[PDB]
């Protein structure tokens, strides 16, 4: 049962090994401590363990061995959750894609103030005068050409320096998924149509008894192929020549030549073909003559689309962290800028919520982001939870719209009147 | 009925051929003894057999021939099982993958002490001070970067030498299978989606009587091809030339040349193509006009996954055996390190349980591991069984999790309203 770093600090009142009246500190959790020992322990500082052993701070190489000292047994006795307080989905007023996206990007309470605050906790640098932990006095929120948030340059002041830098938040290339029945596409319209091909046929059934269906099967297949090969060839030739020459016609210059040829080659390539292959088969239980018509065509298609509530959010932040100026531990301080991943949408290795959980459990997997735990030393990591919740929660609002694409193949089958036949 | 080496030692009290009052020792089982004669017999020592014959120890070449002597008839009269005492599956507290795996790797009673003890019986070297047959005083259990168990270097002492070596146990690359209904994947979410293609169509059925369905069949096929060829060519050319030259224009330098060419080549190659080929066919028993829409798309898919109990364990040990310093018999003592297979999961030739059984039966098949029987000489092989059971038994605990993968193809079929048609 892994112990979270939050409460892990020293219990001042406690004695430890001599009888704390708490649940014992053990070896299993003790080994798990190594990566954040600096947070908990002073260089020389010593801490105990229930099996009659002790831990030492960063000053020493120390293995887990015998000693006497206090520590937290208290926290392990009653662990606390660590969870996000509320997952609830946000409801924003509905509209069209332009406006809905804007409202989301515009929201001070729902987007900006919380995103900025989260940024503040996470390491982002500050700019100029301040009002609270988020968006400063001079700071402002305007739109980038891309639709992202941006501010004016003139004032400057990042980290209290005259440089031009400003924080920006990207709008995502939105992607959504919808579990419910709540959305729909309307009737199609063909802007333009060209007719590629037609095929017609019929079944003639004069006789009374034998009645059977007819099958027309088509295939329209077009394909492209691409390949490249590289060949290496080596030629070895040894030759000898004599000048005796044979009187009739040996040849004055008589040469014999042997050539050995070796060549090898490797290649790769591939092709893709698309086929439109319709099959029509009328059962036609009637004594008749039945025309059938099968059509292939190309067209421009457009559909109006009914409003859909859900949207997924992809966020990566700006590169301000390098300016950040906070105690790092995991990373060295470096000038060159690095964009930090915020992924809200579910990508397991990328997503922030998981990383938050992972930091609590402690897992040594591969990582490329600044960790969550250093906030505990710096800010305490309390009462922040709602702020994180603001960023993490799903947001939805109905956006009505269009469905359109490049011109596509389409097809059709028409059936005629089964004309009465007689013998 | 093969006799196990366990009880096979000499019966001190017995006379043997003269009338032991036990079931007879026979030739069939006697021949099976050769590979472990050294355990049972002294160099000169002699042992009997019921058909009036005798066996001799390693000092002699001895065939099975006449003589008089005692042996065990006693054990063969009443054989004992040799089995693992209990197969029962372990129950560990549930959780997420990070924590469940940890708890398993952390368990002193269930994992470490028994695994170490098993290692001790099997030939693994010891380190420094000891407390019992398993994990020594100085020895400790901490985590490797990989998640494996490791300990500190400073103290040293393997086999009582200052060298750095320490024992390590690998966490497996977990693999599991589940017979029961007990697990599930939740609703899918699409992180991102790109639409590859769309095809639309309809069946028009104005006339009252003829009603029949419509079939749209698609194929999207993409493929890659790779190949390499090597060609060898040999050229043999004999030429002759004369300088007579023909007055009009024979050519002053008149040459005739014959070239024989031989070439051959061999090649190998292959290609793979994947096709997405949907078929949609509405029966549509109605007089109507029915639109159909078929879609191909690409997307990122993610599913939350319900907890699953079972996990299979793959274990191979460290390379400590070379340091081991025990009586070998089968293998020569060598310095270079060799990792020894522990396979818990079922791989027939690899698995430990089978090898244990195989050692009891005696089978000369190909083998690449230290055998089980030498433990009998060294430790007696008693009361160990529960320890082996600790390692061998299946372990399970529900791990909830995610299901994710690289972006994949997906598709969809939509059907329209069958619009009433009239003649």
mmCIF file with all atom_site columns, N, CA, C and O in Angstrom, chain A residues 28 31 34 175 177 249-252 259 261 263-265 267-270 272 277-278 297 303 363 412-413, chain B residues 98 106 141-142 190-191 202-203 214-215 221 224-225 227-229 231 233 235 240-243 254 293:
data_model
loop_
_atom_site.group_PDB
_atom_site.id
_atom_site.type_symbol
_atom_site.label_atom_id
_atom_site.label_alt_id
_atom_site.label_comp_id
_atom_site.label_asym_id
_atom_site.label_entity_id
_atom_site.label_seq_id
_atom_site.pdbx_PDB_ins_code
_atom_site.Cartn_x
_atom_site.Cartn_y
_atom_site.Cartn_z
_atom_site.occupancy
_atom_site.B_iso_or_equiv
_atom_site.pdbx_formal_charge
_atom_site.auth_seq_id
_atom_site.auth_comp_id
_atom_site.auth_asym_id
_atom_site.auth_atom_id
_atom_site.pdbx_PDB_model_num
ATOM 1   N N  . UNK A 1 28  ? 8.999   -2.260  2.588   1.00 0.00 ? 28  UNK A N  1
ATOM 2   C CA . UNK A 1 28  ? 8.501   -2.242  1.240   1.00 0.00 ? 28  UNK A CA 1
ATOM 3   C C  . UNK A 1 28  ? 8.277   -0.830  0.786   1.00 0.00 ? 28  UNK A C  1
ATOM 4   O O  . UNK A 1 28  ? 8.667   -0.462  -0.320  1.00 0.00 ? 28  UNK A O  1
ATOM 5   N N  . UNK A 1 31  ? 11.683  1.500   0.526   1.00 0.00 ? 31  UNK A N  1
ATOM 6   C CA . UNK A 1 31  ? 12.534  1.462   -0.638  1.00 0.00 ? 31  UNK A CA 1
ATOM 7   C C  . UNK A 1 31  ? 11.987  2.377   -1.684  1.00 0.00 ? 31  UNK A C  1
ATOM 8   O O  . UNK A 1 31  ? 12.727  2.860   -2.536  1.00 0.00 ? 31  UNK A O  1
ATOM 9   N N  . UNK A 1 34  ? 13.207  6.570   -2.322  1.00 0.00 ? 34  UNK A N  1
ATOM 10  C CA . UNK A 1 34  ? 14.495  7.068   -2.746  1.00 0.00 ? 34  UNK A CA 1
ATOM 11  C C  . UNK A 1 34  ? 14.431  8.258   -3.663  1.00 0.00 ? 34  UNK A C  1
ATOM 12  O O  . UNK A 1 34  ? 15.291  9.135   -3.587  1.00 0.00 ? 34  UNK A O  1
ATOM 13  N N  . UNK A 1 175 ? -11.343 17.102  -31.881 1.00 0.00 ? 175 UNK A N  1
ATOM 14  C CA . UNK A 1 175 ? -11.735 15.775  -32.258 1.00 0.00 ? 175 UNK A CA 1
ATOM 15  C C  . UNK A 1 175 ? -12.797 15.357  -31.279 1.00 0.00 ? 175 UNK A C  1
ATOM 16  O O  . UNK A 1 175 ? -12.690 15.653  -30.089 1.00 0.00 ? 175 UNK A O  1
ATOM 17  N N  . UNK A 1 177 ? -16.116 12.321  -30.102 1.00 0.00 ? 177 UNK A N  1
ATOM 18  C CA . UNK A 1 177 ? -16.702 11.011  -30.219 1.00 0.00 ? 177 UNK A CA 1
ATOM 19  C C  . UNK A 1 177 ? -18.045 11.075  -29.550 1.00 0.00 ? 177 UNK A C  1
ATOM 20  O O  . UNK A 1 177 ? -18.225 11.830  -28.597 1.00 0.00 ? 177 UNK A O  1
ATOM 21  N N  . UNK A 1 249 ? 43.357  -16.944 -90.445 1.00 0.00 ? 249 UNK A N  1
ATOM 22  C CA . UNK A 1 249 ? 42.698  -15.830 -89.831 1.00 0.00 ? 249 UNK A CA 1
ATOM 23  C C  . UNK A 1 249 ? 42.613  -16.169 -88.378 1.00 0.00 ? 249 UNK A C  1
ATOM 24  O O  . UNK A 1 249 ? 41.524  -16.319 -87.829 1.00 0.00 ? 249 UNK A O  1
ATOM 25  N N  . UNK A 1 250 ? 43.757  -16.347 -87.699 1.00 0.00 ? 250 UNK A N  1
ATOM 26  C CA . UNK A 1 250 ? 43.611  -16.573 -86.297 1.00 0.00 ? 250 UNK A CA 1
ATOM 27  C C  . UNK A 1 250 ? 43.141  -15.277 -85.745 1.00 0.00 ? 250 UNK A C  1
ATOM 28  O O  . UNK A 1 250 ? 42.147  -15.210 -85.024 1.00 0.00 ? 250 UNK A O  1
ATOM 29  N N  . UNK A 1 251 ? 43.871  -14.217 -86.148 1.00 0.00 ? 251 UNK A N  1
ATOM 30  C CA . UNK A 1 251 ? 43.710  -12.839 -85.795 1.00 0.00 ? 251 UNK A CA 1
ATOM 31  C C  . UNK A 1 251 ? 45.057  -12.418 -85.309 1.00 0.00 ? 251 UNK A C  1
ATOM 32  O O  . UNK A 1 251 ? 45.668  -13.106 -84.492 1.00 0.00 ? 251 UNK A O  1
ATOM 33  N N  . UNK A 1 252 ? 45.567  -11.275 -85.797 1.00 0.00 ? 252 UNK A N  1
ATOM 34  C CA . UNK A 1 252 ? 46.873  -10.874 -85.370 1.00 0.00 ? 252 UNK A CA 1
ATOM 35  C C  . UNK A 1 252 ? 46.800  -10.658 -83.902 1.00 0.00 ? 252 UNK A C  1
ATOM 36  O O  . UNK A 1 252 ? 47.658  -11.105 -83.144 1.00 0.00 ? 252 UNK A O  1
ATOM 37  N N  . UNK A 1 259 ? 34.610  -13.187 -68.282 1.00 0.00 ? 259 UNK A N  1
ATOM 38  C CA . UNK A 1 259 ? 34.085  -12.184 -67.410 1.00 0.00 ? 259 UNK A CA 1
ATOM 39  C C  . UNK A 1 259 ? 33.155  -12.838 -66.444 1.00 0.00 ? 259 UNK A C  1
ATOM 40  O O  . UNK A 1 259 ? 32.295  -13.635 -66.817 1.00 0.00 ? 259 UNK A O  1
ATOM 41  N N  . UNK A 1 261 ? 30.215  -12.142 -63.711 1.00 0.00 ? 261 UNK A N  1
ATOM 42  C CA . UNK A 1 261 ? 29.340  -11.060 -63.356 1.00 0.00 ? 261 UNK A CA 1
ATOM 43  C C  . UNK A 1 261 ? 28.591  -11.411 -62.118 1.00 0.00 ? 261 UNK A C  1
ATOM 44  O O  . UNK A 1 261 ? 28.083  -12.522 -61.981 1.00 0.00 ? 261 UNK A O  1
ATOM 45  N N  . UNK A 1 263 ? 25.553  -9.774  -59.560 1.00 0.00 ? 263 UNK A N  1
ATOM 46  C CA . UNK A 1 263 ? 24.711  -8.642  -59.316 1.00 0.00 ? 263 UNK A CA 1
ATOM 47  C C  . UNK A 1 263 ? 23.676  -9.048  -58.319 1.00 0.00 ? 263 UNK A C  1
ATOM 48  O O  . UNK A 1 263 ? 23.335  -10.224 -58.205 1.00 0.00 ? 263 UNK A O  1
ATOM 49  N N  . UNK A 1 264 ? 23.171  -8.071  -57.536 1.00 0.00 ? 264 UNK A N  1
ATOM 50  C CA . UNK A 1 264 ? 22.130  -8.353  -56.591 1.00 0.00 ? 264 UNK A CA 1
ATOM 51  C C  . UNK A 1 264 ? 21.318  -7.105  -56.443 1.00 0.00 ? 264 UNK A C  1
ATOM 52  O O  . UNK A 1 264 ? 21.812  -6.006  -56.685 1.00 0.00 ? 264 UNK A O  1
ATOM 53  N N  . UNK A 1 265 ? 20.031  -7.243  -56.061 1.00 0.00 ? 265 UNK A N  1
ATOM 54  C CA . UNK A 1 265 ? 19.229  -6.061  -55.921 1.00 0.00 ? 265 UNK A CA 1
ATOM 55  C C  . UNK A 1 265 ? 18.158  -6.310  -54.912 1.00 0.00 ? 265 UNK A C  1
ATOM 56  O O  . UNK A 1 265 ? 17.776  -7.450  -54.648 1.00 0.00 ? 265 UNK A O  1
ATOM 57  N N  . UNK A 1 267 ? 14.308  -4.524  -53.471 1.00 0.00 ? 267 UNK A N  1
ATOM 58  C CA . UNK A 1 267 ? 13.378  -3.488  -53.800 1.00 0.00 ? 267 UNK A CA 1
ATOM 59  C C  . UNK A 1 267 ? 12.190  -3.600  -52.914 1.00 0.00 ? 267 UNK A C  1
ATOM 60  O O  . UNK A 1 267 ? 11.940  -4.631  -52.289 1.00 0.00 ? 267 UNK A O  1
ATOM 61  N N  . UNK A 1 268 ? 11.438  -2.492  -52.832 1.00 0.00 ? 268 UNK A N  1
ATOM 62  C CA . UNK A 1 268 ? 10.221  -2.473  -52.089 1.00 0.00 ? 268 UNK A CA 1
ATOM 63  C C  . UNK A 1 268 ? 9.257   -1.689  -52.914 1.00 0.00 ? 268 UNK A C  1
ATOM 64  O O  . UNK A 1 268 ? 9.658   -0.917  -53.785 1.00 0.00 ? 268 UNK A O  1
ATOM 65  N N  . UNK A 1 269 ? 7.950   -1.892  -52.678 1.00 0.00 ? 269 UNK A N  1
ATOM 66  C CA . UNK A 1 269 ? 6.974   -1.168  -53.434 1.00 0.00 ? 269 UNK A CA 1
ATOM 67  C C  . UNK A 1 269 ? 5.634   -1.630  -52.972 1.00 0.00 ? 269 UNK A C  1
ATOM 68  O O  . UNK A 1 269 ? 5.535   -2.508  -52.116 1.00 0.00 ? 269 UNK A O  1
ATOM 69  N N  . UNK A 1 270 ? 4.558   -1.043  -53.534 1.00 0.00 ? 270 UNK A N  1
ATOM 70  C CA . UNK A 1 270 ? 3.246   -1.452  -53.132 1.00 0.00 ? 270 UNK A CA 1
ATOM 71  C C  . UNK A 1 270 ? 2.254   -0.778  -54.027 1.00 0.00 ? 270 UNK A C  1
ATOM 72  O O  . UNK A 1 270 ? 2.598   0.137   -54.774 1.00 0.00 ? 270 UNK A O  1
ATOM 73  N N  . UNK A 1 272 ? -2.269  0.200   -54.403 1.00 0.00 ? 272 UNK A N  1
ATOM 74  C CA . UNK A 1 272 ? -3.565  0.198   -53.790 1.00 0.00 ? 272 UNK A CA 1
ATOM 75  C C  . UNK A 1 272 ? -4.584  0.288   -54.878 1.00 0.00 ? 272 UNK A C  1
ATOM 76  O O  . UNK A 1 272 ? -4.425  1.048   -55.834 1.00 0.00 ? 272 UNK A O  1
ATOM 77  N N  . UNK A 1 277 ? -18.010 -2.614  -56.325 1.00 0.00 ? 277 UNK A N  1
ATOM 78  C CA . UNK A 1 277 ? -18.555 -3.792  -56.935 1.00 0.00 ? 277 UNK A CA 1
ATOM 79  C C  . UNK A 1 277 ? -19.917 -4.080  -56.386 1.00 0.00 ? 277 UNK A C  1
ATOM 80  O O  . UNK A 1 277 ? -20.073 -4.732  -55.356 1.00 0.00 ? 277 UNK A O  1
ATOM 81  N N  . UNK A 1 278 ? -20.957 -3.644  -57.117 1.00 0.00 ? 278 UNK A N  1
ATOM 82  C CA . UNK A 1 278 ? -22.316 -3.808  -56.690 1.00 0.00 ? 278 UNK A CA 1
ATOM 83  C C  . UNK A 1 278 ? -22.845 -5.115  -57.198 1.00 0.00 ? 278 UNK A C  1
ATOM 84  O O  . UNK A 1 278 ? -22.370 -5.641  -58.204 1.00 0.00 ? 278 UNK A O  1
ATOM 85  N N  . UNK A 1 297 ? -21.608 6.452   -60.627 1.00 0.00 ? 297 UNK A N  1
ATOM 86  C CA . UNK A 1 297 ? -21.398 7.841   -60.906 1.00 0.00 ? 297 UNK A CA 1
ATOM 87  C C  . UNK A 1 297 ? -20.496 8.443   -59.866 1.00 0.00 ? 297 UNK A C  1
ATOM 88  O O  . UNK A 1 297 ? -20.154 7.805   -58.871 1.00 0.00 ? 297 UNK A O  1
ATOM 89  N N  . UNK A 1 303 ? -24.045 17.307  -46.618 1.00 0.00 ? 303 UNK A N  1
ATOM 90  C CA . UNK A 1 303 ? -25.118 17.037  -45.694 1.00 0.00 ? 303 UNK A CA 1
ATOM 91  C C  . UNK A 1 303 ? -25.093 18.063  -44.595 1.00 0.00 ? 303 UNK A C  1
ATOM 92  O O  . UNK A 1 303 ? -24.028 18.443  -44.110 1.00 0.00 ? 303 UNK A O  1
ATOM 93  N N  . UNK A 1 363 ? 6.028   5.237   -9.919  1.00 0.00 ? 363 UNK A N  1
ATOM 94  C CA . UNK A 1 363 ? 6.385   4.279   -10.926 1.00 0.00 ? 363 UNK A CA 1
ATOM 95  C C  . UNK A 1 363 ? 7.522   4.880   -11.693 1.00 0.00 ? 363 UNK A C  1
ATOM 96  O O  . UNK A 1 363 ? 7.473   6.023   -12.143 1.00 0.00 ? 363 UNK A O  1
ATOM 97  N N  . UNK A 1 412 ? -26.292 3.323   -57.972 1.00 0.00 ? 412 UNK A N  1
ATOM 98  C CA . UNK A 1 412 ? -27.722 3.320   -57.931 1.00 0.00 ? 412 UNK A CA 1
ATOM 99  C C  . UNK A 1 412 ? -28.203 2.073   -58.612 1.00 0.00 ? 412 UNK A C  1
ATOM 100 O O  . UNK A 1 412 ? -27.514 1.552   -59.489 1.00 0.00 ? 412 UNK A O  1
ATOM 101 N N  . UNK A 1 413 ? -29.383 1.541   -58.208 1.00 0.00 ? 413 UNK A N  1
ATOM 102 C CA . UNK A 1 413 ? -29.961 0.448   -58.948 1.00 0.00 ? 413 UNK A CA 1
ATOM 103 C C  . UNK A 1 413 ? -31.415 0.766   -59.157 1.00 0.00 ? 413 UNK A C  1
ATOM 104 O O  . UNK A 1 413 ? -32.117 1.142   -58.219 1.00 0.00 ? 413 UNK A O  1
ATOM 105 N N  . UNK B 2 98  ? -0.003  -0.631  -11.828 1.00 0.00 ? 98  UNK B N  1
ATOM 106 C CA . UNK B 2 98  ? 1.212   -0.260  -11.173 1.00 0.00 ? 98  UNK B CA 1
ATOM 107 C C  . UNK B 2 98  ? 1.267   -0.885  -9.811  1.00 0.00 ? 98  UNK B C  1
ATOM 108 O O  . UNK B 2 98  ? 2.241   -1.562  -9.481  1.00 0.00 ? 98  UNK B O  1
ATOM 109 N N  . UNK B 2 106 ? 6.659   -6.907  -3.940  1.00 0.00 ? 106 UNK B N  1
ATOM 110 C CA . UNK B 2 106 ? 6.920   -6.544  -2.568  1.00 0.00 ? 106 UNK B CA 1
ATOM 111 C C  . UNK B 2 106 ? 6.743   -7.657  -1.561  1.00 0.00 ? 106 UNK B C  1
ATOM 112 O O  . UNK B 2 106 ? 7.331   -7.589  -0.484  1.00 0.00 ? 106 UNK B O  1
ATOM 113 N N  . UNK B 2 141 ? 15.941  -5.544  -0.042  1.00 0.00 ? 141 UNK B N  1
ATOM 114 C CA . UNK B 2 141 ? 15.102  -5.619  -1.213  1.00 0.00 ? 141 UNK B CA 1
ATOM 115 C C  . UNK B 2 141 ? 14.684  -4.225  -1.614  1.00 0.00 ? 141 UNK B C  1
ATOM 116 O O  . UNK B 2 141 ? 13.895  -3.587  -0.918  1.00 0.00 ? 141 UNK B O  1
ATOM 117 N N  . UNK B 2 142 ? 15.173  -3.732  -2.779  1.00 0.00 ? 142 UNK B N  1
ATOM 118 C CA . UNK B 2 142 ? 14.854  -2.408  -3.257  1.00 0.00 ? 142 UNK B CA 1
ATOM 119 C C  . UNK B 2 142 ? 14.516  -2.530  -4.711  1.00 0.00 ? 142 UNK B C  1
ATOM 120 O O  . UNK B 2 142 ? 14.634  -3.607  -5.288  1.00 0.00 ? 142 UNK B O  1
ATOM 121 N N  . UNK B 2 190 ? -13.302 8.220   -29.173 1.00 0.00 ? 190 UNK B N  1
ATOM 122 C CA . UNK B 2 190 ? -12.374 8.499   -30.233 1.00 0.00 ? 190 UNK B CA 1
ATOM 123 C C  . UNK B 2 190 ? -11.665 9.772   -29.933 1.00 0.00 ? 190 UNK B C  1
ATOM 124 O O  . UNK B 2 190 ? -12.257 10.846  -29.876 1.00 0.00 ? 190 UNK B O  1
ATOM 125 N N  . UNK B 2 191 ? -10.342 9.654   -29.716 1.00 0.00 ? 191 UNK B N  1
ATOM 126 C CA . UNK B 2 191 ? -9.531  10.781  -29.385 1.00 0.00 ? 191 UNK B CA 1
ATOM 127 C C  . UNK B 2 191 ? -9.460  11.697  -30.565 1.00 0.00 ? 191 UNK B C  1
ATOM 128 O O  . UNK B 2 191 ? -9.640  12.904  -30.438 1.00 0.00 ? 191 UNK B O  1
ATOM 129 N N  . UNK B 2 202 ? -28.380 4.329   -53.561 1.00 0.00 ? 202 UNK B N  1
ATOM 130 C CA . UNK B 2 202 ? -29.763 4.135   -53.239 1.00 0.00 ? 202 UNK B CA 1
ATOM 131 C C  . UNK B 2 202 ? -30.390 3.195   -54.215 1.00 0.00 ? 202 UNK B C  1
ATOM 132 O O  . UNK B 2 202 ? -29.847 2.925   -55.285 1.00 0.00 ? 202 UNK B O  1
ATOM 133 N N  . UNK B 2 203 ? -31.552 2.638   -53.813 1.00 0.00 ? 203 UNK B N  1
ATOM 134 C CA . UNK B 2 203 ? -32.340 1.774   -54.640 1.00 0.00 ? 203 UNK B CA 1
ATOM 135 C C  . UNK B 2 203 ? -33.637 2.494   -54.851 1.00 0.00 ? 203 UNK B C  1
ATOM 136 O O  . UNK B 2 203 ? -34.246 2.967   -53.893 1.00 0.00 ? 203 UNK B O  1
ATOM 137 N N  . UNK B 2 214 ? -30.681 -4.407  -52.179 1.00 0.00 ? 214 UNK B N  1
ATOM 138 C CA . UNK B 2 214 ? -29.608 -3.762  -52.876 1.00 0.00 ? 214 UNK B CA 1
ATOM 139 C C  . UNK B 2 214 ? -28.335 -4.085  -52.161 1.00 0.00 ? 214 UNK B C  1
ATOM 140 O O  . UNK B 2 214 ? -28.297 -4.098  -50.931 1.00 0.00 ? 214 UNK B O  1
ATOM 141 N N  . UNK B 2 215 ? -27.259 -4.378  -52.921 1.00 0.00 ? 215 UNK B N  1
ATOM 142 C CA . UNK B 2 215 ? -26.014 -4.731  -52.296 1.00 0.00 ? 215 UNK B CA 1
ATOM 143 C C  . UNK B 2 215 ? -24.939 -3.808  -52.776 1.00 0.00 ? 215 UNK B C  1
ATOM 144 O O  . UNK B 2 215 ? -24.783 -3.580  -53.976 1.00 0.00 ? 215 UNK B O  1
ATOM 145 N N  . UNK B 2 221 ? -7.887  -1.700  -50.622 1.00 0.00 ? 221 UNK B N  1
ATOM 146 C CA . UNK B 2 221 ? -6.771  -2.567  -50.405 1.00 0.00 ? 221 UNK B CA 1
ATOM 147 C C  . UNK B 2 221 ? -5.499  -1.805  -50.608 1.00 0.00 ? 221 UNK B C  1
ATOM 148 O O  . UNK B 2 221 ? -5.325  -1.108  -51.607 1.00 0.00 ? 221 UNK B O  1
ATOM 149 N N  . UNK B 2 224 ? 2.214   -3.546  -49.621 1.00 0.00 ? 224 UNK B N  1
ATOM 150 C CA . UNK B 2 224 ? 3.605   -3.224  -49.771 1.00 0.00 ? 224 UNK B CA 1
ATOM 151 C C  . UNK B 2 224 ? 4.292   -4.454  -50.287 1.00 0.00 ? 224 UNK B C  1
ATOM 152 O O  . UNK B 2 224 ? 3.853   -5.574  -50.028 1.00 0.00 ? 224 UNK B O  1
ATOM 153 N N  . UNK B 2 225 ? 5.387   -4.272  -51.057 1.00 0.00 ? 225 UNK B N  1
ATOM 154 C CA . UNK B 2 225 ? 6.084   -5.401  -51.605 1.00 0.00 ? 225 UNK B CA 1
ATOM 155 C C  . UNK B 2 225 ? 7.556   -5.194  -51.395 1.00 0.00 ? 225 UNK B C  1
ATOM 156 O O  . UNK B 2 225 ? 8.049   -4.071  -51.489 1.00 0.00 ? 225 UNK B O  1
ATOM 157 N N  . UNK B 2 227 ? 11.502  -7.233  -52.180 1.00 0.00 ? 227 UNK B N  1
ATOM 158 C CA . UNK B 2 227 ? 12.160  -8.380  -52.745 1.00 0.00 ? 227 UNK B CA 1
ATOM 159 C C  . UNK B 2 227 ? 13.599  -8.043  -52.980 1.00 0.00 ? 227 UNK B C  1
ATOM 160 O O  . UNK B 2 227 ? 13.979  -6.876  -53.038 1.00 0.00 ? 227 UNK B O  1
ATOM 161 N N  . UNK B 2 228 ? 14.443  -9.092  -53.094 1.00 0.00 ? 228 UNK B N  1
ATOM 162 C CA . UNK B 2 228 ? 15.832  -8.906  -53.401 1.00 0.00 ? 228 UNK B CA 1
ATOM 163 C C  . UNK B 2 228 ? 16.261  -10.073 -54.240 1.00 0.00 ? 228 UNK B C  1
ATOM 164 O O  . UNK B 2 228 ? 15.801  -11.197 -54.033 1.00 0.00 ? 228 UNK B O  1
ATOM 165 N N  . UNK B 2 229 ? 17.147  -9.833  -55.232 1.00 0.00 ? 229 UNK B N  1
ATOM 166 C CA . UNK B 2 229 ? 17.579  -10.905 -56.086 1.00 0.00 ? 229 UNK B CA 1
ATOM 167 C C  . UNK B 2 229 ? 19.066  -10.812 -56.244 1.00 0.00 ? 229 UNK B C  1
ATOM 168 O O  . UNK B 2 229 ? 19.652  -9.736  -56.147 1.00 0.00 ? 229 UNK B O  1
ATOM 169 N N  . UNK B 2 231 ? 22.156  -12.105 -58.913 1.00 0.00 ? 231 UNK B N  1
ATOM 170 C CA . UNK B 2 231 ? 22.349  -12.800 -60.146 1.00 0.00 ? 231 UNK B CA 1
ATOM 171 C C  . UNK B 2 231 ? 23.813  -12.972 -60.367 1.00 0.00 ? 231 UNK B C  1
ATOM 172 O O  . UNK B 2 231 ? 24.617  -12.089 -60.068 1.00 0.00 ? 231 UNK B O  1
ATOM 173 N N  . UNK B 2 233 ? 26.659  -13.937 -63.285 1.00 0.00 ? 233 UNK B N  1
ATOM 174 C CA . UNK B 2 233 ? 26.753  -14.102 -64.703 1.00 0.00 ? 233 UNK B CA 1
ATOM 175 C C  . UNK B 2 233 ? 28.166  -14.444 -65.048 1.00 0.00 ? 233 UNK B C  1
ATOM 176 O O  . UNK B 2 233 ? 29.111  -13.906 -64.471 1.00 0.00 ? 233 UNK B O  1
ATOM 177 N N  . UNK B 2 235 ? 30.727  -14.875 -68.447 1.00 0.00 ? 235 UNK B N  1
ATOM 178 C CA . UNK B 2 235 ? 30.790  -14.628 -69.857 1.00 0.00 ? 235 UNK B CA 1
ATOM 179 C C  . UNK B 2 235 ? 32.044  -15.250 -70.380 1.00 0.00 ? 235 UNK B C  1
ATOM 180 O O  . UNK B 2 235 ? 33.129  -15.061 -69.831 1.00 0.00 ? 235 UNK B O  1
ATOM 181 N N  . UNK B 2 240 ? 38.834  -14.354 -82.774 1.00 0.00 ? 240 UNK B N  1
ATOM 182 C CA . UNK B 2 240 ? 39.944  -14.522 -83.668 1.00 0.00 ? 240 UNK B CA 1
ATOM 183 C C  . UNK B 2 240 ? 39.940  -13.323 -84.557 1.00 0.00 ? 240 UNK B C  1
ATOM 184 O O  . UNK B 2 240 ? 38.894  -12.707 -84.765 1.00 0.00 ? 240 UNK B O  1
ATOM 185 N N  . UNK B 2 241 ? 41.114  -12.939 -85.095 1.00 0.00 ? 241 UNK B N  1
ATOM 186 C CA . UNK B 2 241 ? 41.118  -11.787 -85.942 1.00 0.00 ? 241 UNK B CA 1
ATOM 187 C C  . UNK B 2 241 ? 42.188  -11.968 -86.977 1.00 0.00 ? 241 UNK B C  1
ATOM 188 O O  . UNK B 2 241 ? 43.200  -12.615 -86.722 1.00 0.00 ? 241 UNK B O  1
ATOM 189 N N  . UNK B 2 242 ? 41.972  -11.415 -88.190 1.00 0.00 ? 242 UNK B N  1
ATOM 190 C CA . UNK B 2 242 ? 42.952  -11.532 -89.234 1.00 0.00 ? 242 UNK B CA 1
ATOM 191 C C  . UNK B 2 242 ? 43.229  -10.155 -89.745 1.00 0.00 ? 242 UNK B C  1
ATOM 192 O O  . UNK B 2 242 ? 42.424  -9.244  -89.565 1.00 0.00 ? 242 UNK B O  1
ATOM 193 N N  . UNK B 2 243 ? 44.399  -9.962  -90.388 1.00 0.00 ? 243 UNK B N  1
ATOM 194 C CA . UNK B 2 243 ? 44.741  -8.647  -90.845 1.00 0.00 ? 243 UNK B CA 1
ATOM 195 C C  . UNK B 2 243 ? 44.787  -8.633  -92.341 1.00 0.00 ? 243 UNK B C  1
ATOM 196 O O  . UNK B 2 243 ? 45.342  -7.703  -92.924 1.00 0.00 ? 243 UNK B O  1
ATOM 197 N N  . UNK B 2 254 ? 40.011  -7.287  -89.341 1.00 0.00 ? 254 UNK B N  1
ATOM 198 C CA . UNK B 2 254 ? 38.824  -8.085  -89.482 1.00 0.00 ? 254 UNK B CA 1
ATOM 199 C C  . UNK B 2 254 ? 38.717  -9.002  -88.316 1.00 0.00 ? 254 UNK B C  1
ATOM 200 O O  . UNK B 2 254 ? 39.539  -9.901  -88.159 1.00 0.00 ? 254 UNK B O  1
ATOM 201 N N  . UNK B 2 293 ? -25.410 4.872   -46.940 1.00 0.00 ? 293 UNK B N  1
ATOM 202 C CA . UNK B 2 293 ? -24.161 5.582   -46.886 1.00 0.00 ? 293 UNK B CA 1
ATOM 203 C C  . UNK B 2 293 ? -23.146 4.665   -46.263 1.00 0.00 ? 293 UNK B C  1
ATOM 204 O O  . UNK B 2 293 ? -23.392 4.111   -45.194 1.00 0.00 ? 293 UNK B O  1
#
